[PDB]
Amino acid sequence: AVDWRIDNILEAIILMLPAMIANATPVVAGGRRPVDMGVVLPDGRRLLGDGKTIEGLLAGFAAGSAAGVLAALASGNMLLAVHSPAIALGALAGDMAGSFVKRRLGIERGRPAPLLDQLDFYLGALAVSIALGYTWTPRVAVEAAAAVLLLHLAANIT
Amino acid sequence: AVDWRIDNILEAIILMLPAMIANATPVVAGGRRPVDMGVVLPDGRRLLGDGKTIEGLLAGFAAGSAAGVLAALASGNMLLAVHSPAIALGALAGDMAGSFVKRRLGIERGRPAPLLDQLDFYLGALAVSIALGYTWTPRVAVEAAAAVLLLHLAANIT
Numbered sequence A, B: 001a002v003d004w005r006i007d008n009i010l011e012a013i014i015l016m017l018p019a020m021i022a023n024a025t026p027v028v029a030g031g032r033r034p035v036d037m038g039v040v041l042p043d044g045r046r047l048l049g050d051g052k053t054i055e056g057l058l059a060g061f062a063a064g065s066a067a068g069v070l071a072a073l074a075s076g077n078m079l080l081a082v083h084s085p086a087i088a089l090g091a092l093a094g095d096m097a098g099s100f101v102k103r104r105l106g107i108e109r110g111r112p113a114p115l116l117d118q119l120d121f122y123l124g125a126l127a128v129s130i131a132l133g134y135t136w137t138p139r140v141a142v143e144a145a146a147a148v149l150l151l152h153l154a155a156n157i158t
Ligand SMILES: Nc1ccn([C@@H]2O[C@H](COP(=O)(O)OP(=O)(O)OP(=O)(O)O)[C@@H](O)[C@H]2O)c(=O)n1
Pocket: A026, A027, A028, A030, A031, A048, A049, A050, A051, A052, A053, A054, A055, A056, A057, A095, A098, A099, A100, A102, A108, A109, A110, A111
């Protein structure tokens, strides 16, 4: 069950799974057309870099929308099918905002920014869910962030 | 005033100011003897790197202890003079743990790891305060973290 007060970790995980899926899909869908059209800024660095492709955004968005159907059916909350596309967009925007910040700091495309690399999409998606009218408790907002960390390190321990 | 339930941002700021001061002091005190004795690990990277010096740790510890005297006098809570050295140590340990993680990821000494570079000392200090018996609310734990970010970006906007 998902209501407007996100106050347990399973409910956060249901709400956020479209974002997680939107964030993870571009690594398999590939892509080769950069969102930033290859633009370099006056600091010598790409605006976003090659890691952000238009095929990535579309597959991520498509995947997040499809997952929100599953979130809506699993939870009985049909609003999840309407909200999950917007949340997917926030996840995708936050991942790009993180790449933007890495480039401005001189961090080359692909080099690790620990914490930021794992949480940027979560923070964009979280921001959108709040713009949509959801209230998070701070504890469950922290737990979900740590659950994102645990699964990323869970993805790499396998 | 500082009690055992850290539940407002000013009380968190008083408790944490020794850690902030412990974390900031090594950048001026210099230092040239690495904590890691120059050891390189089998992955080819330094254990900690040159950025962690023994003079840094001592000046940081000294500074954090001195600040806890000010925290104890400002708040009327004499236990702050006893706790602030341990909290300073947690701040120093967390900053080293962050450098450790950067080296294992191939991030060279001094290259930016945004978020991690600003929060590692806060997380060590927070861990020690909880080991000491303090309870944080999640909201004030998040606020203080964002206040650390805001001041670091405040340090750089001046
Ligand atoms: N909008 C996106 C997001 C990611 N990806 C693909 O997924 C990979 C991994 O994503 P990410 O780790 O975020 O990109 P990085 O290669 O690490 O680049 P950056 O340093 O900007 O994070 C990218 O290389 C890219 O192949 C994509 O095509 N389009």
